[PDB]
Design a protein around this ligand. Structure first.
Ligand code: A1D9Z
Ligand code: A1D9Z
Lengths: 124, 121
């Protein structure tokens, strides 16, 4: 793959939890979009079940014609960091969920996946 | 300023609402971090009142001893895009709010400010 980031989204789309999990350094953290920190930190031992939960969610939204769309990573002037814009979309194009990941890489592995998403609310 | 993104944040830190607003192109959008879209689209005519609101909230959080930190913008390999990481911290340093802006520029103006934030507890 053209980067570990590409490898990660490849494996996840295919449901290869173990392949996606191995993209992360042993000292990596996945900083989820929601929690008390604010957000929520997952270490490498906890990321695999997160990936399991996400794979469960993925095929149930797919079972309703939803598509998850992950854009090409665009790197920062720091070549070990990149953003990935992403969305979850109904078959008719309606955006259900939209977010951005800030990746920090090290030694060809993911060191940080910092996840953000728009909060769907009645009013901003 | 080092860039129009720098000018926006410096103008805002200086309470210059009109100077910050002027950084946006007339066809710019501010894609807010919450709302039904998901998020919420504000056009250039609506952005000024958002800046007035944020100026007041900044003064309020400061009086409660909180600290807003906006990191140096980092451009992408596409030089018309950049991220700014930001956070809001309690006096001691506890983070109560954390986010990131993805900027799109055109001809020296802000065209898109796409705002994201963590959802708390
Ligand atoms: C269980 C809570 C963890 C989540 C979170 O809140 C923040 C976090 O970072 O990880 C979890 C969310 C997340 O990252 C991603 C990639 C979300 C994309 C999409 O919206 C999901 C519904 C999964 C999906 C169908 C992908 C395409 O098939
Ligand atoms: C109410 C106005 C709309 C907001 C919103 O809900 C979503 C949106 O995208 O823009 C507005 C939110 C916003 O930009 C930021 C950066 C909020 C962080 C923090 O809370 C402020 C107190 C930061 C600050 C000025 C610190 C002073 O040092």
């Amino acid at each position: 793959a053209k980067s570990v980031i590409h490898q990660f989204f490849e494996s996840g789309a295919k449901g290869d939890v173990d392949g996606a999990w191995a993209c992360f350094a042993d000292d990596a953290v996945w900083l989820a979009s929601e929690g008390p920190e604010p957000g929520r930190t997952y270490t490498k031992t906890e990321i695999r079940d997160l990936l399991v939960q996400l794979d469960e969610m993925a095929r149930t939204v797919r079972a309703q014609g939803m598509d998850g769309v992950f854009e090409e990573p665009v790197f920062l002037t720091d070549p070990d960091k990149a953003v990935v814009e992403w969305s979850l979309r109904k078959a008719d194009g309606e955006v259900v969920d939209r977010g951005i990941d800030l990746f920090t890489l090290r030694d060809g592995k993911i060191l940080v996946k910092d996840v953000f998403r728009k909060a769907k609310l009645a009013a901003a």
